[PDB]
């Protein structure tokens, strides 16, 4: 038969200690029916003290785990034993500290013990569903960024089972997938609710026994929550062998078939799932080779001579770094060159690096202000082999450590290399510019020698020719680092490859490095000179004096404090700089666009997406913008949406809007210091048919207003090429907030489906923006680099960037790709209309 598993069902699956284990389905939940050992299978210790390795995995993150053991579940001796089929003496102990004698209290010694699953048959293991569950993480874990999700709180400690679950879902967590697991607090309380006093365990004698739970004490580094004989959830040090094991699995109901039994306590459902197909169960990671080979091509490479100051141990004394062109739309001189490098990527895992870079890069290019410049970035991935992965703790190429604050820092001290943080500017950068870059600037100085006048001066050229240095770490850890002191040569960011926020963190850190933007969450008064120094942060309360006064009232720009009472002020509560979920704010888009325009010579104007809003007069004057609370910001956003007649709200227009003023508004920045720009704005009510709407007397309902945008004199002072810092500049230079207000006539003829239509025209009549722009379709373009015969050029991994629909890409193709010479381009100067359009640059050899 195929059973139906109810709460209280008893199954007899597997054998431990030569007795089949009676499991009971305590709860039914989303993953499946939950089977819990009826009696504590054995009396063992969650995790022994640190014996073998203290520099890798859980025992590394706190040194008190030498004394007591580790409350990390993924590494635990319990997870390793419960989920092992291994023969005796061969259980992989994931943390690397086995449950050896003298590290588990008392007799202990469950190293040399066969895995729990070893005596089981393969079919019985198949019947346990491989489930991905949240496991709360302790402070050593959540300060080294070992967290799969957003949630910020420590679990509150309540001993009663009723109150034990408090804060669980809001608590720090990471997701672990396994067949056999010890119950967490939520699941123990579920067992309680469904099955009364069954949450108190009983051993073979029948005396009540404490049993371990996988929930750690989030405030503590070693302690583990456990269920005692009385029934109190409590904390025990994990090294002790007094406490019991009550393993639980999730039945895979569909394949499961019970050959015998009714599921009663006396007569359990005896069953397994034969036809279910699985690779042999191994929670253990596959073992890669000691000496890898490159997954990727080495045909195009840069070779670095790193002396003692850069590699004191000597493992990177002459690295060969393969180079991959993810994007080379134009020449390096004309474009912004981004160099991404790899941390904790072994030779065999370099393909992953390339794909990761592509992933992250493309996701970053979905964000504006980058999207406007997507085709202007030259993107290069440098394959920097690491002897070990980041999580293995072996020597990594860049020596990245994570400090106590979750900050990822290249450590000069770790291998005793004083100048490791200077590797990008002094070692990697000069070689890239000499070899890969079209400028081919020969290296004037020896990084290994000592410069004569300023130890930081000669390397200043690197940052001109390379816009950004990025480091991607082969980690699911969540951390971000931005290092932006050009005087001392530091222009680089460190970000993770597979964190839940990997692409968001990448975009954020890129915003520091290239755009120059600061963290909007940071708390602290900005004094006068520092206040001039910050592009996106101000401590000026008065709306009339604030830097972004012109942009106030545009889209979601209301000036608000980042945190309560704080003297630090931001243009929008929702920006990527404060919260990585949210997109870049208008001040950031403007300032980053201006910075990138300094880097590339084509752009002449910035037109923010115009918005048509009804003109109540709310938020129309500087006084209205005085309140600086976050609540007031959200009230402004509500009023804006209730007024908005543009974009997605283009259909909010109605027959009643006669006698009502409507306001078209944009912010326009003139990127040209030399010549001022006259831009015409046209706003007419549009019938669904498409003809301009009329009043009763037939006069068209349309408004025209010509705004002249001034020159950008302070251009030289705002992030010029060749600039160490933004010491002072004027926000308002070259910036005009253009507002056209139209009184819809009181006698106007309005029908259903009429919508406001606006063209922002230049002098020649080219339409810079229109009512379709905000909603306009973005179509993916893939750039490919091929030989004449159609064979793929090696060391090129073309990315995908989004261009607006109907965009005709007109970018002079780069004369040379590596030593290859450009013969033709396919797909340029043609409307891009399909997602997945491919532009193929053909080079010859
Ligand atoms: Zn351990
Ligand atoms: Zn930041
Ligand atoms: Zn912002």
Numbering used by the authors: 32 to 876
Give the exact sentences the study uses for this entry.
The sole known peptidase capable of cleaving both IgA1 and IgA2 is IgAse, a unique enzyme encoded by Thomasclavelia ramosa (formerly Clostridium ramosum).
Subsequently, we obtained a high-resolution map at 2.8 Å with a 300-kV microscope, which enabled us to build a near-atomic structure of the NTD, CD, WD, and Oβ domains. No map density was observed beyond Oβ due to the intrinsic inter-domain flexibility of the sample (see Section 2.8). This process was repeated iteratively until the final structure was obtained, which encompassed residues S32–N876, three zinc ions, as well as one glycerol and seven azide molecules from the concentrator buffer, and 151 solvent molecules. The NTD is connected to the CD through an extended linker (S315–D324) (right), which is well-defined in the map.
